[PDB]
């Protein structure tokens, strides 16, 4: 059975039914400290910073695999680093130990471009590169990638991870995250309202659409245990763009749309990250691939965001 922690997040919201559709409705169990509609799929409240709660859940549902999504993101982490550290650091440690302790075949941890810092090359950055994160979030994530690879090499625990860039999606509502401007913008656009962007006009960052984000995670998860070499830290991306670019492209569809720039601390966060990633390793080892280019995600988002507003 599959346990998904932090199932109520941007990813978890869609990953759950995605998994249910592919593996069976009662072979998946959603969990978080905040509950949301799981379309019938079994849900349980689980605090990842409490080792006891994790063990008991693994016990009762005979957990076979774990998609560990619980954690605090970059923006919220800078507003409350003590919290980011507690849930991210203590949290992923607890799950690793709980997984190693019991009979857990696999554990997938989504990593982030946040593991990068200002010394990291800005373009075509490969998976093996400099990793000196400047945010509490990025520190806890690089720690996660290393802890996972260590548990694998040391105890054989099959933990894998890929680094997601900014993710565009419509099912889950934005949460003021560093890269969330790429989602908030569509909401203002469909309402033909002026949007106040918090990242610089030319703040280039790698991004991808949720559909490809989901497939990438499951493909990583379905990869043969003995065919993965990098295993942890796979750079994954679909395209790179600036807020200014996304704006103009959306304007081509909704010309009335207006935008203004009022950057804050989140732009300082984004400035420490690379603009584009090289994902050859993910494609070479487990065939990672994108089927939604920018044009396709823009139209798709407008379509979905308008229909639900």
Ligand X SMILES: NC(=O)c1ccc[n+]([C@@H]2O[C@H](COP(=O)([O-])OP(=O)(O)OC[C@H]3O[C@@H](n4cnc5c(N)ncnc54)[C@H](O)[C@@H]3O)[C@@H](O)[C@H]2O)c1
Q: What angle do CA 300, 208, 49 make, to 5 degrees?
A: 115
By CB under 6 A, is residue 136 in contact with ligand X? Answer: no
- Tell me which of 55, 97, 245, 300 binds a second copy, using CB under 8 A: 97
What is each CA distance from 239 to 164, 207, 296, in whole angstroms?
12, 6, 12
Q: Is 5 labeled as ligand-binding?
A: no
Query: What pairing do the DSSP bridges indicate for beta strands 205-209 and 239-241?
Result: antiparallel
By CB under 8 A, is residue 142 in contact with a second copy? Answer: yes
Binding residues for a second copy, total number by CB under 8 A? 28
By CB under 6 A, is residue 87 in contact with ligand X? Answer: yes
Q: Is 179 labeled as ligand-binding?
A: yes
Nearer to a second copy, 97 or 258 (CB): 97
By CB under 8 A, is residue 92 in contact with a second copy? Answer: no
Q: Could you tell me the smallest distance in angstroms from the CB atom of residue 233 to a second copy?
A: 8
- Tell me which of 3, 66, 91, 223 binds ligand X, using CB under 6 A: 91
Query: How far apart are the C-alpha atoms of 200 and 244, rounded to whole Å?
Result: 8
Query: How far apart are the C-alpha atoms of 92 and 54, rounded to whole Å?
Result: 11
What is each CA distance from 1 to 5, 42, 158, 230, 232, in whole angstroms?
13, 11, 15, 26, 23
Q: Nearest Cα to 210, choosing from 92, 95, 296?
A: 296
Q: Nearest Cα to 98, choosing from 59, 139, 126, 132?
A: 59
By CB under 6 A, is residue 211 in contact with ligand X? Answer: no
Stretch that binds ligand X, among 4-12, 226-234, 278-286, 297-305 (CB under 6 A): 4-12
Q: Which does 33 bind (CB under 5 to 8 A by kind): ligand X, a second copy, none?
A: ligand X
Minimal CB distance residue for ligand X: 9
Nearer to a second copy, 69 or 144 (CB): 144
Our answer to whether residue 239 is catalytic in this structure is: no
By CB under 8 A, is residue 264 in contact with a second copy? Answer: no
- Tell me which of 38, 94, 131, 179 binds ligand X, using CB under 6 A: 179
Q: What angle do CA 79, 81, 86 make, to 5 degrees?
A: 135
What is each CA distance from 203 to 55, 85, 236, in whole angstroms?
43, 27, 19
By CB under 8 A, is residue 46 in contact with a second copy? Answer: no
Name the 3-class secondary structure at 95.
helix
Q: Is 178 labeled as ligand-binding?
A: yes
Stretch that binds ligand X, among 163-171, 188-196, 219-227, 282-290 (CB under 6 A): 163-171
Q: Is 69 labeled as ligand-binding?
A: yes
Among residues 85, 137, 195, 292, the one annotated as catalytic is 137
Stretch that binds a second copy, among 56-64, 142-150, 175-183, 218-226 (CB under 8 A): 142-150
Stretch that binds ligand X, among 22-30, 63-71, 247-255, 264-272 (CB under 6 A): 63-71
CB burial readout 104-118, b (16+ within 10 A) else e: bebbbbbbbbbbbbe
Query: How far apart are the C-alpha atoms of 301 and 307, rounded to whole Å?
Result: 10
Strands laid side by side in the 106-112 sheet: 43-45, 28-32, 2-5, 65-68, 106-112, 158-164, 232-235
By CB under 8 A, is residue 93 in contact with a second copy? Answer: yes
User: Residues forming the annotated binding site for pyruvate?
Assistant: 74, 112, 137, 178-179
Q: Which residues bind ligand X (CB under 6 A)?
A: 5-6, 8-12, 32-34, 46-49, 69-73, 87, 91, 110-112, 141, 164, 166-167, 175, 177, 179
Active site residues: 137
């Amino acid at each position: 059975m599959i346990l998904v922690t932090g199932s109520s997040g941007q990813i978890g919201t869609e990953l759950v039914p995605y998994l249910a559709e592919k593996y069976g409705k009662k072979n998946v169990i959603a969990s978080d400290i905040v509950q949301r509609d799981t379309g019938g799929i079994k849900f349980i409240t689980l605090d990842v910073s409490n080792r006891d709660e994790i063990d008991r859940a693994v016990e009762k549902y005979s957990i076979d695999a774990i998609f560990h999504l619980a954690g605090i993101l970059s923006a919220k982490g800078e507003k409350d680093p003590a919290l980011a550290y507690k849930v991210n650091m203590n949290g992923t440690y607890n799950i690793l130990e709980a997984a190693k302790q019991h009979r857990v075949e696999k554990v997938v941890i989504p990593s982030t471009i946040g593991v990068f810092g200002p010394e990291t090359p800005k373009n075509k950055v490969p998976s093996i590169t400099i990793t000196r994160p400047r945010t509490m979030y990025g520190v806890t994530k690089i720690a996660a990638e290393l802890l996972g690879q260590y548990y694998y090499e040391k105890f054989g625990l099959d933990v894998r991870s890929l680094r997601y860039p900014g993710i565009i999606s419509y099912k889950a509502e934005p949460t003021a995250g560093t890269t969330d401007y790429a989602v908030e913008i569509f909401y203002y656009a469909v309402k033909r309202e002026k949007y106040k962007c918090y990242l610089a006009p030319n703040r280039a960052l790698p991004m991808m659409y949720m559909p490809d984000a989901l497939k990438a995670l499951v493909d990583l998860y379905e990869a043969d245990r003995d065919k993965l070499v990098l295993r942890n830290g796979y750079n994954v991306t679909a395209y790179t763009f600036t807020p200014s670019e996304l704006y103009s492209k959306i304007k081509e569809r909704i010309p009335e749309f207006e935008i203004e720039y009022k950057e804050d601390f989140r732009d300082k966060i984004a400035a420490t990250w690379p603009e584009s990633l090289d994902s050859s390793e993910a494609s070479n080892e487990w065939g990672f691939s994108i089927e939604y280019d920018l044009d396709r995600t823009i139209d798709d988002m407008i379509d979905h965001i308008s229909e639900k507003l």
